[PDB]
Amino acid sequence: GIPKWRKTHLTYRIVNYTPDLPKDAVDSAVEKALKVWEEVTPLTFSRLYEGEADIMISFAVREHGDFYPFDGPGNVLAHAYAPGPGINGDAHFDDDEQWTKDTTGTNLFLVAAHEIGHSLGLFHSANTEALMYPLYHSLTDLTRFRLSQDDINGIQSLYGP
Ligand SMILES: O=C(CN(CCO)S(=O)(=O)c1ccc(-c2ccccc2)cc1)NO
Ligand SMILES: [Ca+2]
Ligand SMILES: [Ca+2]
Numbered sequence: 001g002i003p004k005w006r007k008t009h010l011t012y013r014i015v016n017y018t019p020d021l022p023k024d025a026v027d028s029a030v031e032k033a034l035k036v037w038e039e040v041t042p043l044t045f046s047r048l049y050e051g052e053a054d055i056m057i058s059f060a061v062r063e064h065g066d067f068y069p070f071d072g073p074g075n076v077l078a079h080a081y082a083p084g085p086g087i088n089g090d091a092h093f094d095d096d097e098q099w100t101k102d103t104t105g106t107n108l109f110l111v112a113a114h115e116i117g118h119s120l121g122l123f124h125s126a127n128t129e130a131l132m133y134p135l136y137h138s139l140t141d142l143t144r145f146r147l148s149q150d151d152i153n154g155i156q157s158l159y160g161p
């Protein structure tokens with residue numbers, strides 16, 4: 001049990017969207033990803049807009065010159081930060097892509113969950129069922145989507161025993 005600067009309560013801010021799909025896709029994805037950890041660990045969060053909350057989820061169009069420019073439908077889709085004094089819980093989403101909620105392309109729900117897990121203080125895992133797996137698995141089985149012992153231990157080290 002050792003979370004972000006020992007803080008149990010983290011605030012998140014939505015500063016991203018999707019040009020392809022509706023706003024339910026992006027807003028609910030961030031919250032479902034944010035709360036997917038809430039449904040697994042006793043973490044506390046709040047969604048606001050002030051200026052900059054703990055976790056800041058922003059969009060990144062082709063002018064993405066902070067790490068990698070737009071790649072279109074490439075294998076890369078997002079990047080996030082966690083153990084930092086400033087970049088604490090901050091991520092970016094490739095705007096130039098087909099963000100979808102049904103796995104029809106760039107699953108923004110799975111990606112957000114994976115990005116949120118990163119921002120919370122976790123890196124990559126090894127199990128194929130793990131939400132923190134280094135590969136976006138085209139798993140059409142959204143009825144079997146869940147957290148696994150692999151990523152579970154990762155978030156457990158953060159907010160658990
Ligand atoms: O993981 C990433 C981005 N990627 C590079 C990792 O090598 S990726 O290839 O775009 C990517 C995207 C999504 C997922 C993913 C999403 C949901 C569940 C499991 C994996 C894994 C990698 N950033 O933290
Ligand atoms: Ca891409
Ligand atoms: Ca931050």
Ligand SMILES: [Zn+2]
Pocket residue numbers: 060064066067079091092
């Ligand atoms: Zn970026």
Ligand SMILES: [Zn+2]
Pocket residue numbers: 114118123124133134
């Ligand atoms: Zn990752």
